[PDB]
Symmetry: D3
Subunit: 82 residues, 6 copies
């Protein structure tokens, strides 16, 4: 088991990931119930500047990026962990 | 029936619905965003990319303004 | 359909109620997923003084009362709605 | 003066603001998103369609990119 | 001075405090429970076992009824 | 396996556990209370009356101090 932020995110996503999609400036990341804030916290700890911000509900996370291009780059980075 | 459950819940919980771009902002009574979000998530609506719920406001994300209008219109039909 | 706070609570509980139990000074009220705050809000709007306060998670509400006797009285009042 | 409460709260909890398209992302101190969101919703500005708050991040949805800038600059005025 | 931040926040958001047994129930303005909870957790007082915050209500769990009173009175000092 | 899932999740998310009276206060990493709460709710533990989760703290309610100790000891066994 690896402990850096990315590895913690990767690990957490193994159990928690449900879906990821994007539209325009935002990524919609769906998690297992009650896991949105947990995953949001790990994401916020990655410190990816391309991520303008994250807003987490209970099982859904919205990641806002400045541009569609930034959104894709962040989505791709997350996808890599899956 | 998910749709019927949502309609029932919206009677008391609904406050406002609007949209811009590819999203719908649905305002509920205080504390109701998650409850309504749970019902909307149970809808079998492919066009609904997801919902993110605060306390009294739900953001419904669709891919496109056209999908957004479709989804909003379907919610409006329940009021 | 009736619209007073109690009737709104009663109505909301028809769909949302899962379990109610108590221990000492507190009631544990379990709801359908994502319904704790919704039910907490209705409960807080009843203005029952015997209720010291409510703290809601996602599907679980803790109602704190000053005494076990108060707790029972509030639990009984809720039970009546079910 | 009506903004004094929001100004006060921002002075203690504001971290950063940015916007993109129809949205403003406002970061607060941990656990302050709902608190600032309530103050923002209380403003009842028609340029703000709504807010969704997480724990430390608020998304404000405005009706247009122009409204978004207008709202963002109004908030920045308070800092 | 280390409590100044919590005092400030309470001055704007505190509604009421009560306690029973091992617990303190602190009511805040809507959406302020997590915000005050964060300030309280930052205190890292060993008399407070922890806090759980809803939207406008914080439950502080202390180790004993005596600790509960001690903590409640410390908080009341700030008002 | 619910227990195994919880154990796996606790590796990263666990911070502190304590108890008083008939409750357990379980502190997790920021933002993890609900995630861990979901796992604990999936345990088939009759003694656990329920959990209420904040942001990083979970309150686990049991009926009695004896049940509380039992439940805490079972959680401690996972660390
Ligand atoms: N258990 C629940 N709260 N379910 C509803 C989730 C609603 C929405 N997807 C959100 O994450 O904010
Ligand atoms: N009682 C409250 N938390 N009010 C603030 C709500 C802020 C925002 N509309 C949301 O639903 O996330
Ligand atoms: N979808 C979830 N968040 N599930 C976990 C709920 C945890 C706990 N029963 C609470 O209501 O706070
Ligand atoms: N302590 C936490 N919950 N941290 C994660 C916050 C995630 C995201 N920025 C939000 O506010 O929803
Ligand atoms: N706007 C709301 N969520 N209101 C209900 C609050 C319920 C309860 N007092 C809590 O803080 O958890
Ligand atoms: N980032 C935060 N919301 N921090 C405050 C947490 C307050 C309290 N321990 C809870 O979990 O509800």
């Amino acid at each position: 088991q690896r402990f850096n932020p990315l590895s913690k995110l990767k690990r957490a996503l193994m159990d928690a990931f449900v879906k990821i999609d994007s539209a325009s400036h935002m990524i919609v990341l769906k998690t297992m119930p009650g896991n949105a804030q947990a995953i949001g916290a790990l994401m916020d700890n990655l410190d990816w500047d391309e991520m303008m911000g994250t807003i987490c509900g209970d099982d859904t996370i919205l990641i806002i990026c400045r541009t569609p291009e930034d959104t894709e780059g962040v989505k791709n980075r997350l996808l890599e962990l899956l």
